[PDB]
Amino acid sequence: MLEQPYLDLAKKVLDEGHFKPDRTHTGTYSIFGHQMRFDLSKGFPLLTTKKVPFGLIKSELLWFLHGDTNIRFLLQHRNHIWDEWAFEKWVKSDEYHGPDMTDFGHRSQKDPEFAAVYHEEMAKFDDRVLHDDAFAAKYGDLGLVYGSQWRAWHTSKGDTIDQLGDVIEQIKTHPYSRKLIVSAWNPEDVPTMALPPCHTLYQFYVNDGKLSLQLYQRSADIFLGVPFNIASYALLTHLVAHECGLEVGEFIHTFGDAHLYVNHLDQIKEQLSRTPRPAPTLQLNPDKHDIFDFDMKDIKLLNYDPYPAIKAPVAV
Template identity: 60%
Template structure:
């Protein structure tokens, strides 16, 4: 039985039945609950990519590799047709003195209800994407998202003035001392929040080694149940597979711990549709065994096998 979709659906029902209505930064409104945990056995249950709707695995892979490269600029993602982060960079541009196009105030909400505006928005977004890809100066200024995940994971700046590669530390420490209780990566840097276009939602994770298996628990301050969480679950599962591969371990458990777990008010019907669907068998993944280091992997080195989900369910992103 596919317990991954079942646990995910259980959480969806819980939020709808017990959540409180809350306003939020985006102005969209949510149904929210505080504090929830899910556990997935990566070894027994298959790769945790939801089957009750199609989730774009290639986007998960390219985003994770972007983090692992220590990159914070959108160009790599756009080169790989990944648009997960576009809206935050676009917002930075249209709110700057350098922008002279049509008014894009509240573009996230307006594009959902005003067809005429949506045409203008899509035109400006395309201009933005092309400039990120082809204009080095523009890309440097408006394609960089600030000190987000890639920077924190690979180039954490300490109070001592030193720069720390947290991912390399984790790998080295697992190999040296697998029983360590300090296998932690932290992406929440209070002194750098102002320099991040979106402060980290999944802000910390910790590994645990026992009986030759690597488990991972990741913690999130803010959880978009419908759009974000399916990607987060699969991304941290993939990270666990990659770290285990380099360290000569099998995979164990993936544990999600969420603080403010919410459904946006304009996602409720989509959530109900997904909750009505029967889970299918989970896929598996295959890593290129010739790649030894986590940092050597490219998109084509990670193969998804046997994925047969229900159709995609579209919903707007709250920016």
């Protein structure tokens, strides 16, 4: 089945992943260097052996495509995937005067009541960003996140480069170019960042009128991370193909440190006992072609029939 490569990665890490301690002191089982491919002509690689929220995937991707860096957009779509990042700044600001939120991420993980005051402050923060424009401009803007890296790479000369916009043009004028590359890694910024890009670099490739894309992910959470990562980039591959009038080829996913956190083993084992169902089909707006001017309604997933979702503790 289409998603089999993912299940095969989960197995391999269980069988031969060496224990390797990580920064979160949680513990992991990892392997270095792995690659899997998905034939996008066979279907959309959104897992069926477990329910994945495609809505969070499409919204976040469009957010990236717009060159947006402000969370406000996301909250407007109920997408909270990045809140933790903006909320941190607020908490550590001189304007922040409320309950000490030190190590709130896992502190909430170890306190039902702390998580109460914490989920309270968070709910407030999200409200301000949603309504108070000046507050949003100050705390809702992540700054250095995929959107600016893809669409507004700051140059020494003081300008900004639209990597993605330029590459799409190159695909339209030199499809056989061996350097349709977009980077998210900037040695200048990487040192001072909290979490340097996990999706370090990706490359397009065209042949026989088909578009393929290879992604280099330096670090990966097999259980919680990967199911999403696959959907984000397979979707990007479709959008760019659509915009360039090409057929879709395959999404090649290359890994650096693929890992399983020790606290996801029972969950991963369970999923492995499930049998993949046919993959869903993706459908994009035929009339509209400028992918940068796309919105939710322009992308629809069909025939997605997953198994129930699988809950598991995030490693914080």
